[PDB]
Amino acid sequence: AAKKIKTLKLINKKKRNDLRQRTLRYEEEYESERKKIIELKREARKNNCFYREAEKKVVFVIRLKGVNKLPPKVRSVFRLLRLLQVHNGVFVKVNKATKEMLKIVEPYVTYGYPTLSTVRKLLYKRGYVRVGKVRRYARKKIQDNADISKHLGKYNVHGIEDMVYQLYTCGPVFKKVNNFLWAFKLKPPRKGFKAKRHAFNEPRPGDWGNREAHINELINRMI
Amino acid sequence: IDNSLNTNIHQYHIVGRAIPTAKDKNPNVYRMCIFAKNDTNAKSRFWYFMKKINKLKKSNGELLACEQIKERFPLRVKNYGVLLRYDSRTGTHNMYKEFRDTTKEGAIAQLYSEMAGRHRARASSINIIRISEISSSLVRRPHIKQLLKRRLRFPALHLPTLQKEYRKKFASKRPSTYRM
Amino acid sequence: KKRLQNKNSLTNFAVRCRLNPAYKLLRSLAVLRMRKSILEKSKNKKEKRVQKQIQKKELQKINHDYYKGVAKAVKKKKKREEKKAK
Amino acid sequence: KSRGKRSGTRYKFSKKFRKHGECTANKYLEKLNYGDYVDIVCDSTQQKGMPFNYYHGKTGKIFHITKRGVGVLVNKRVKHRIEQKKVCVRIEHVRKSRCNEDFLLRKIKNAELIKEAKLKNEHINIKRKTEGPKPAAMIKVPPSKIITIEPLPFY
Amino acid sequence: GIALKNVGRIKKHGRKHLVSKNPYLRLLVKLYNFLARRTNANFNKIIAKRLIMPKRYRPPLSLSKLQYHMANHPNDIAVVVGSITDDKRLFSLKQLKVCALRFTETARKRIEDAGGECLTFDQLALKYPTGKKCVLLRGPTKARTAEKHFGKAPGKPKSKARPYVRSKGRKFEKARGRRKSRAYKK
Amino acid sequence: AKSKNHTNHNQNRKAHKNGIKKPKKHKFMSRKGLDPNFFRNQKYCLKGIQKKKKELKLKAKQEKNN
Amino acid sequence: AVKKVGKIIKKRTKKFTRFQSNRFMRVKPAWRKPRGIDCRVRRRYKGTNLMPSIGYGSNKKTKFLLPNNKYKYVVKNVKEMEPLIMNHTKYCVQIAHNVSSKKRKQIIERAKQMNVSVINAKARL
RNA sequence: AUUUCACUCAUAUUAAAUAAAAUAACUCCAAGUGGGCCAUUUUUGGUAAGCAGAACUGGCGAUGAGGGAUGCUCCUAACGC
RNA sequence: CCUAUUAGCUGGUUAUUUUCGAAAGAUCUCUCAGGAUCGCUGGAGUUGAUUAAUAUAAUUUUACCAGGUAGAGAUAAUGAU
RNA sequence: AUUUUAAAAUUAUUUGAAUUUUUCUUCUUAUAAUUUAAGUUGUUUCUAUACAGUACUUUCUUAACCCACUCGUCUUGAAAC
């Protein structure tokens, strides 16, 4: 009867080991990605040619306005991408459907491309997870890989580093990881906004719209 | 480095192309350098101009390059002539203005400030055409011509701008604006 | 289970290594790479920069050609305006 | 004060320019079966069996077929709920709906793909792709093809 | 401020606790929701839920329907949370093993003479805690008269709702709106 | 006095408060007034099918119960 | 403001008073929720007689205990003291107001030998 | 057309995406309400109106808080301690 | 005295906390200061879900439909000029 | 009173291996301890060597800074001249 704890311990050891190996391979993959991008851009410069990189496939979008005075279409889209509070943030996979959904809500959000370090620190610092049985979730901070394994293990994604990988690269298990992840509740920016009323792309100071790579500096002071 | 002194206008070189279709196989590639706070604003302006001059919009187009041009000699002073199109409260006008400073970005920031101060022309009403270095021989505006004398010197009649620490409220005796 | 304090998963080393089994190895490798002395880079900066002469040449030519194109466009629009003026 | 049957149908029930005249003879050969989707477009040249103003351009599945008429079940929004409405029209006012044709072609093509995939013991994605972000490309272009664009002056 | 339906609180519908202050029924409810919680049995969960229901949702079941439902499996036990009533239209019973909340005196006597036996829910918990070979049955819940007045109002087209009338002669609510000869019909 | 004759204001909000209900879409629809001489024939088809099926089942039951 | 002694934290003092009771004699200070239409207090205008809420509720671990960190129990004779023999350090005893000096001495001495503290020990003497 | 037998059409990510989607669906009984008004945009009559009459959405009503000195309707934002 | 006549009208309508929470549309009406009836709301109850699905959606994508408002036209028709 | 466990980390020994080649290199082999795990603990003073005061708790009365228009009611709208 005492053998059950022993086998549980050994399978936990095995899980820790292949999680370590998976994380190491993820790190190699990130480094190789950066190296190949740099070298390929260098080759494109050397030849008389152009190199356009792929779109990042993942957008971090944070709400900017409150819950009052919104058109019903805007409210429906906000419900669909789980942006319910004024400073909520979520990950969205980028395709034509989600891009069109984001277009109708653009003046009320700001979004961009999260990059690996900000994805990791978002998960580590503000990462909360829906634990309970379906429709009874009971948000809990991660603090452990046990619940990640319990709910998402069947996709071979037991581990916060696996979650980070699946989020940073729009991996085969992205919808599941995103849905498992509670919507991020962010604090106001450390140095404040420019003007929530105006677009980021307006020549005057403004905040809403697609920030592209500039979302990271904002997340860092909103975190 | 002094961030208070530093503006945040930068020059961006942007190259784009319509998505190839069945109708045309090799669309001509459009290239332009513009001035914006950041590369995102730069790309937005590039696509705005693509739509305005060509019949090409963001949806049917793709980026090919977006880099930042840095001044080769950020500490040499050079004269810039910038052509300009802006719309007023009652019409649209072209004007040519001259500046002189180290970087084209600084010249453009000067231009935006001057337009706002003189003609109340907001940045949304401004379209920069053809900013380029000009030699001292063909400088046209007198306020730039007078800055290219063989030996330039003048006094420093500006009032002192002391530190907040030494900007004390009660003074023991009346300070002198005469200075020197 | 009873709720305890949510330990900072980034600064609390024990909880960070518990969450990321590879983190302590990665951090140790980073520390080892940091612990390198200065004489090697002092005597290899010239070696690393002299091989970049061809890169500087290549990057000079693209910007040179871009400025040539800009100047050519300026000249052609000026010529068009001069032709139209009369 | 006026809510007749054909009120407000001045343009909706008018024939197109140079497209007047009775329905083509081939339309009477159209094959209709129970339960298939059908479009309700009113043909003004045929007065009997004309659908009501609202249902022009709507779609619904056939629930009844008679000698020269079709009863088609159409959803109508009434304040706080949709409700099913049985509209009875003649043949000229109904046409086979293409609202399903992409689904039918997808079914056939996907079946004949799944058969071969299972034959070769391969795993395939049968769902539609909702194509999004394009991959990185390494494109070449002659230097004589790049053209410099700058905003135009006013005139 | 946050945008949630029902301000974020899950809403359930229906009974939560038994309203009956019957000590024996309270003991039964305690035992059976203990069984439902501890065992995995949906059988036990359903019994615990049905013990909670109002009187109108545990209708009587006749011996005729009991026999008919238990026709195919003769060795199992019919568990019905309502009461069991005798059916005079039935000629003969056969060897019935039935657990029920209440038994009519006539139904009880008929079952004992037929050779089966009547079981209470505490005995059912004692002998079949999980519910092996126990068929869960219930009488007609929509058969009661009050339901004949529900649905579409009497007067709506094709409505079968029975109206509320003093009596049902020819001179009671049968003239205008119930025949074509007087204005419309239904 | 003069009365506000009409407005559709707030009606859409009222409609969406309990959602726009959809029809239940049952599997079988009553055939009360549809295609006679066809559904009568269908009744005959079904009657014959039950007759043959039930007589086969009765034959099996009799030969298995002796 | 909040008052905190030991583990007991009282989230609010100065019990709520009825609106306008200060300037009307017929209006007693005992709290009544104002229905009104334009009522100020009901609308929660700032700087006017805030209303009681459930948010002021003291925590249930230290709800009913007195400053001596134990619950009070009111007794009328020595017979009602028996249950205190088990929880003499969780309950203090208060003698009911209508108990005579006959019985008050008896209850005081019984509580003394029972080792349970008395709140109004020096009453009627 | 129905019925019965066969074979089998992705499901291991789910026949496109997203979804604190079952907080659903249905039934019963019943309250109050059935004078509205304002803002943006559109619009009819009118010279115009803080005028009369309509459309969409959001608000005020039913609602406080920070700001607009001041203000039922503006901006921010909706409220346990 | 019948008679505490009737009043679609005015005034009033008595403890606390907690939870849910409107309508000022619509149809008919000797109806326009009213009513009934839908709609909106509460309570009750069952069937379901509780299986990161399916039902479902003030959302999008894909496929396919219908339109004659903005614009445009007067040399395309009518009406002008 | 049968998960403040397990592990995770650290220290001290120990087994083999790897590798960026080692005074925080990593991975296990065992042992024993710690907490960085597994939501604040310790020391010293004072209260004070008192039985109710000038301290401490509390009520009340006064100030002071900021804020605060009569409630009930009909009403779209009441502090309403």
Short mmCIF file of N, CA, C and O (backbone and C1' of nucleotides) in Angstrom, two decimals, chain C residues 1-5 7 12-18 21 24-25 27-29 31-33 35-36, chain J residues 3-11 19-27 35-40:
data_model
loop_
_atom_site.label_atom_id
_atom_site.label_comp_id
_atom_site.label_asym_id
_atom_site.label_seq_id
_atom_site.Cartn_x
_atom_site.Cartn_y
_atom_site.Cartn_z
N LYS C 1 -6.99 23.44 -0.39
CA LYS C 1 -5.98 23.79 0.59
C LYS C 1 -6.08 25.25 1.00
O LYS C 1 -6.54 26.10 0.24
N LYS C 2 -5.64 25.53 2.22
CA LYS C 2 -5.59 26.90 2.71
C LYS C 2 -4.70 27.75 1.83
O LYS C 2 -3.64 27.31 1.38
N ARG C 3 -5.14 28.97 1.57
CA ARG C 3 -4.34 29.90 0.78
C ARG C 3 -3.19 30.44 1.61
O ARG C 3 -3.40 30.92 2.73
N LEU C 4 -1.99 30.37 1.08
CA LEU C 4 -0.82 30.97 1.69
C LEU C 4 -0.41 32.19 0.88
O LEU C 4 -1.07 32.59 -0.08
N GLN C 5 0.70 32.80 1.28
CA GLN C 5 1.25 33.91 0.51
C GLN C 5 1.73 33.40 -0.84
O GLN C 5 2.43 32.40 -0.92
N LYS C 7 4.21 33.36 -3.30
CA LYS C 7 5.61 33.74 -3.38
C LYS C 7 5.93 34.29 -4.77
O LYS C 7 5.40 33.83 -5.78
N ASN C 12 12.01 34.90 -5.69
CA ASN C 12 12.15 33.81 -4.74
C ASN C 12 12.77 32.61 -5.45
O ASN C 12 12.10 31.93 -6.23
N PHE C 13 14.05 32.36 -5.18
CA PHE C 13 14.80 31.39 -5.98
C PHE C 13 14.23 29.98 -5.84
O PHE C 13 14.17 29.24 -6.82
N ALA C 14 13.84 29.59 -4.63
CA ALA C 14 13.32 28.25 -4.44
C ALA C 14 12.06 28.02 -5.26
O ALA C 14 11.94 27.02 -5.97
N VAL C 15 11.12 28.97 -5.22
CA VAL C 15 9.90 28.80 -5.99
C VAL C 15 10.18 28.91 -7.48
O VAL C 15 9.54 28.22 -8.28
N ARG C 16 11.14 29.74 -7.88
CA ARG C 16 11.44 29.85 -9.30
C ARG C 16 12.03 28.56 -9.84
O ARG C 16 11.68 28.12 -10.94
N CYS C 17 12.93 27.93 -9.09
CA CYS C 17 13.48 26.66 -9.53
C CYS C 17 12.44 25.55 -9.47
O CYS C 17 12.48 24.62 -10.27
N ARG C 18 11.50 25.64 -8.53
CA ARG C 18 10.41 24.67 -8.48
C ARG C 18 9.53 24.79 -9.72
O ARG C 18 9.09 23.78 -10.27
N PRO C 21 12.40 23.85 -13.78
CA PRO C 21 13.53 22.98 -13.43
C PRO C 21 14.82 23.31 -14.16
O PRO C 21 15.89 22.87 -13.71
N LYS C 24 17.87 27.02 -12.80
CA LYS C 24 19.13 27.13 -12.07
C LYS C 24 20.31 26.83 -12.98
O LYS C 24 21.34 27.50 -12.88
N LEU C 25 20.16 25.88 -13.90
CA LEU C 25 21.22 25.64 -14.87
C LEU C 25 21.42 26.85 -15.77
O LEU C 25 22.55 27.27 -16.03
N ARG C 27 20.72 30.01 -15.19
CA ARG C 27 21.30 31.12 -14.44
C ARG C 27 22.76 30.86 -14.13
O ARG C 27 23.58 31.78 -14.18
N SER C 28 23.11 29.62 -13.79
CA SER C 28 24.51 29.31 -13.53
C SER C 28 25.35 29.52 -14.78
O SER C 28 26.47 30.04 -14.71
N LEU C 29 24.82 29.13 -15.94
CA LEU C 29 25.54 29.36 -17.19
C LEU C 29 25.70 30.85 -17.45
O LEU C 29 26.77 31.30 -17.89
N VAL C 31 25.84 33.22 -15.21
CA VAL C 31 26.82 33.74 -14.26
C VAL C 31 28.23 33.37 -14.69
O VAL C 31 29.16 34.18 -14.61
N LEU C 32 28.42 32.13 -15.17
CA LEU C 32 29.73 31.73 -15.67
C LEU C 32 30.16 32.60 -16.84
O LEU C 32 31.30 33.06 -16.89
N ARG C 33 29.25 32.85 -17.77
CA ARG C 33 29.57 33.71 -18.90
C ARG C 33 29.88 35.13 -18.45
O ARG C 33 30.71 35.81 -19.05
N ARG C 35 31.29 35.90 -15.57
CA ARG C 35 32.52 35.90 -14.80
C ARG C 35 33.78 35.90 -15.66
O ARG C 35 34.86 35.64 -15.13
N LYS C 36 33.67 36.18 -16.95
CA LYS C 36 34.84 36.22 -17.81
C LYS C 36 35.61 37.52 -17.61
O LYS C 36 35.02 38.58 -17.39
P U J 3 -3.30 13.65 4.85
"O5'" U J 3 -2.33 14.82 4.37
"C5'" U J 3 -1.38 15.37 5.26
"C4'" U J 3 -0.44 16.31 4.55
"C3'" U J 3 -0.98 17.70 4.26
"O3'" U J 3 -0.93 18.54 5.41
"C1'" U J 3 0.17 16.84 2.36
P U J 4 -0.61 20.11 5.32
"O5'" U J 4 0.98 20.18 5.21
"C5'" U J 4 1.63 21.40 4.89
"C4'" U J 4 2.99 21.52 5.53
"C3'" U J 4 3.04 21.17 7.01
"O3'" U J 4 4.36 20.78 7.36
"C1'" U J 4 3.50 23.46 6.74
P U J 5 4.68 19.27 7.80
"O5'" U J 5 4.66 18.49 6.42
"C5'" U J 5 5.73 17.65 6.04
"C4'" U J 5 5.23 16.55 5.14
"C3'" U J 5 6.09 16.25 3.93
"O3'" U J 5 7.19 15.40 4.24
"C1'" U J 5 3.83 16.42 3.28
P A J 6 8.60 15.63 3.52
"O5'" A J 6 8.30 15.33 1.98
"C5'" A J 6 7.89 14.05 1.55
"C4'" A J 6 7.28 14.10 0.18
"C3'" A J 6 8.18 14.66 -0.91
"O3'" A J 6 9.04 13.67 -1.43
"C1'" A J 6 6.06 15.69 -1.03
P A J 7 10.59 13.67 -1.05
"O5'" A J 7 11.30 14.07 -2.41
"C5'" A J 7 11.77 15.39 -2.60
"C4'" A J 7 11.07 16.08 -3.73
"C3'" A J 7 11.70 17.40 -4.14
"O3'" A J 7 12.85 17.21 -4.95
"C1'" A J 7 9.43 17.76 -3.74
P A J 8 13.12 18.01 -6.31
"O5'" A J 8 12.91 19.54 -5.94
"C5'" A J 8 12.49 20.45 -6.93
"C4'" A J 8 12.65 21.87 -6.46
"C3'" A J 8 14.02 22.22 -5.94
"O3'" A J 8 14.95 22.50 -6.97
"C1'" A J 8 12.39 23.01 -4.45
P A J 9 16.50 22.15 -6.78
"O5'" A J 9 17.04 23.33 -5.87
"C5'" A J 9 16.86 24.68 -6.24
"C4'" A J 9 17.07 25.59 -5.06
"C3'" A J 9 18.36 25.37 -4.30
"O3'" A J 9 19.45 26.04 -4.89
"C1'" A J 9 16.56 25.46 -2.78
P U J 10 20.92 25.43 -4.77
"O5'" U J 10 21.31 25.69 -3.26
"C5'" U J 10 21.36 27.01 -2.74
"C4'" U J 10 21.64 27.00 -1.27
"C3'" U J 10 22.79 26.12 -0.83
"O3'" U J 10 24.05 26.74 -1.00
"C1'" U J 10 20.93 25.71 0.56
P U J 11 25.35 25.83 -1.21
"O5'" U J 11 25.65 25.26 0.24
"C5'" U J 11 25.86 26.14 1.33
"C4'" U J 11 25.93 25.39 2.63
"C3'" U J 11 26.87 24.20 2.66
"O3'" U J 11 28.22 24.59 2.84
"C1'" U J 11 24.82 23.59 3.64
P U J 19 30.86 16.30 -22.67
"O5'" U J 19 30.91 17.89 -22.53
"C5'" U J 19 29.81 18.69 -22.94
"C4'" U J 19 29.67 19.90 -22.07
"C3'" U J 19 30.87 20.83 -22.02
"O3'" U J 19 30.94 21.71 -23.12
"C1'" U J 19 30.10 20.42 -19.83
P U J 20 32.31 22.47 -23.49
"O5'" U J 20 32.63 23.34 -22.20
"C5'" U J 20 33.24 24.62 -22.31
"C4'" U J 20 32.22 25.72 -22.20
"C3'" U J 20 32.37 26.66 -21.01
"O3'" U J 20 33.35 27.65 -21.22
"C1'" U J 20 30.10 26.01 -21.24
P U J 21 34.70 27.65 -20.35
"O5'" U J 21 34.48 26.44 -19.33
"C5'" U J 21 34.24 26.70 -17.96
"C4'" U J 21 35.35 26.17 -17.08
"C3'" U J 21 36.76 26.40 -17.62
"O3'" U J 21 37.64 26.65 -16.52
"C1'" U J 21 36.37 24.07 -17.36
P U J 22 37.68 28.11 -15.86
"O5'" U J 22 36.60 28.04 -14.70
"C5'" U J 22 36.67 27.01 -13.73
"C4'" U J 22 35.58 27.10 -12.70
"C3'" U J 22 35.99 26.56 -11.34
"O3'" U J 22 35.21 27.19 -10.33
"C1'" U J 22 34.32 25.16 -12.26
P U J 23 35.66 28.63 -9.77
"O5'" U J 23 35.40 28.53 -8.21
"C5'" U J 23 34.12 28.17 -7.71
"C4'" U J 23 33.93 28.60 -6.28
"C3'" U J 23 34.09 30.09 -6.02
"O3'" U J 23 33.22 30.48 -4.96
"C1'" U J 23 35.69 28.89 -4.76
P C J 24 31.95 31.41 -5.26
"O5'" C J 24 30.91 30.43 -5.97
"C5'" C J 24 30.52 29.22 -5.35
"C4'" C J 24 29.10 28.86 -5.72
"C3'" C J 24 28.85 28.56 -7.19
"O3'" C J 24 29.16 27.22 -7.52
"C1'" C J 24 27.21 30.06 -6.39
P U J 25 30.44 26.87 -8.42
"O5'" U J 25 29.83 26.35 -9.79
"C5'" U J 25 29.18 27.26 -10.67
"C4'" U J 25 28.51 26.54 -11.81
"C3'" U J 25 27.56 25.42 -11.43
"O3'" U J 25 26.30 25.88 -11.01
"C1'" U J 25 28.95 24.72 -13.21
P U J 26 25.38 24.97 -10.06
"O5'" U J 26 24.78 23.88 -11.05
"C5'" U J 26 23.99 24.27 -12.16
"C4'" U J 26 23.79 23.14 -13.12
"C3'" U J 26 23.17 21.88 -12.55
"O3'" U J 26 21.76 21.98 -12.44
"C1'" U J 26 25.02 21.31 -13.90
P C J 27 20.96 21.10 -11.36
"O5'" C J 27 21.00 19.64 -11.97
"C5'" C J 27 20.43 19.37 -13.24
"C4'" C J 27 20.77 17.98 -13.71
"C3'" C J 27 20.50 16.88 -12.71
"O3'" C J 27 19.13 16.51 -12.68
"C1'" C J 27 22.63 16.57 -13.66
P U J 35 15.15 27.01 9.45
"O5'" U J 35 14.91 28.04 8.26
"C5'" U J 35 15.99 28.79 7.72
"C4'" U J 35 15.80 29.09 6.26
"C3'" U J 35 14.45 29.69 5.88
"O3'" U J 35 14.62 30.54 4.75
"C1'" U J 35 14.75 27.68 4.72
P U J 36 14.77 32.12 4.93
"O5'" U J 36 14.84 32.66 3.44
"C5'" U J 36 13.66 32.74 2.65
"C4'" U J 36 13.91 32.31 1.23
"C3'" U J 36 13.17 31.06 0.78
"O3'" U J 36 11.85 31.35 0.37
"C1'" U J 36 15.44 30.93 0.12
P A J 37 10.60 30.99 1.31
"O5'" A J 37 10.24 29.50 0.93
"C5'" A J 37 9.96 29.12 -0.41
"C4'" A J 37 9.71 27.65 -0.51
"C3'" A J 37 8.42 27.15 0.13
"O3'" A J 37 7.30 27.30 -0.72
"C1'" A J 37 10.21 25.81 0.86
P A J 38 5.96 27.98 -0.17
"O5'" A J 38 5.45 27.00 0.97
"C5'" A J 38 4.27 27.30 1.70
"C4'" A J 38 4.45 27.04 3.18
"C3'" A J 38 5.70 27.63 3.80
"O3'" A J 38 5.44 27.96 5.16
"C1'" A J 38 5.75 25.29 4.02
P G J 39 5.04 29.46 5.57
"O5'" G J 39 4.13 29.96 4.37
"C5'" G J 39 2.88 30.60 4.60
"C4'" G J 39 3.01 32.10 4.47
"C3'" G J 39 3.15 32.86 5.79
"O3'" G J 39 3.99 33.98 5.55
"C1'" G J 39 1.39 33.76 4.58
P U J 40 5.32 34.20 6.39
"O5'" U J 40 4.81 34.24 7.89
"C5'" U J 40 4.88 35.44 8.64
"C4'" U J 40 5.81 35.27 9.81
"C3'" U J 40 5.15 35.24 11.18
"O3'" U J 40 5.95 34.43 12.04
"C1'" U J 40 6.66 37.02 11.09
#
